């Protein structure tokens, strides 16, 4: 009886837990989304360095 009118909040409290769990994960998505455009773009420049460093090898070595 009372457990019903009581346990009701035993979940309304969790409904809040996940409310933050859903947000926490989503906050990481954007942090990893931007990191995906700066990390991949990073090695992209490394590719330019790999080609440049490779040529400096076929001339001075």
């Amino acid at each position: 009886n009372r457990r019903l009118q009581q346990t009701q909040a035993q979940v309304d409290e969790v409904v809040d837990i996940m409310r933050v769990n859903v947000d926490k994960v989503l906050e990481r998505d954007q942090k990893l989304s931007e990191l995906d455009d700066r990390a991949d773009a990073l090695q992209a420049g490394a590719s330019q360095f790999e080609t440049s460093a490779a040529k400096l090898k076929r001339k001075y070595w």
Binding site: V14, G45, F49, L56
Partner: protein
């Protein structure tokens, strides 16, 4: 209606289990990954650190070379309760994995950028001494 509610809602309490159980299943896949990924990022971070090192050397070289119905209805609640505790278990593992990685992303973004510059500067000094 009276009975169509004391039982229907009772079916909801029974269902209230799979509802909070399917959540665990959904949480497992998440945690299992958050953990798997956690270790991955460790080898991933090594990349930003590995490049951070080499670039320093690479830069130097480019510088050197450049110059009883209610009794059960009460039990189902206890069941939900026992599961609510679980929801806390995942909520913490998910939480501690999130906060620990977010700060990790910070370090990654930092070093990644720091190295990006060294690459650009080196790429502007190397491209000229091309061929």
């Amino acid at each position: 209606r009276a009975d169509q509610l004391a039982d229907e809602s009772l079916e909801s309490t029974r269902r209230m289990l799979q509802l909070v159980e399917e959540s665990k299943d959904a949480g497992i896949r998440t945690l299992v990954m958050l953990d798997e990924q956690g270790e991955q990022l460790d080898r991933v971070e090594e990349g930003m650190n590995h490049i951070n090192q080499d670039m320093k050397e690479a830069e130097k070289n480019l510088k050197d070379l450049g110059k009883a119905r209610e009794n059960e209805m009460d039990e189902n609640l206890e069941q939900v309760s026992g599961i609510i505790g679980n929801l806390r278990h995942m909520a913490l593992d998910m939480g501690n994995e999130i906060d620990t990685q977010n700060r990790q992303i910070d370090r990654i973004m930092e070093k990644a950028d720091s190295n990006k510059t060294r690459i650009d500067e080196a790429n502007q000094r190397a491209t000229k001494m091309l061929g």
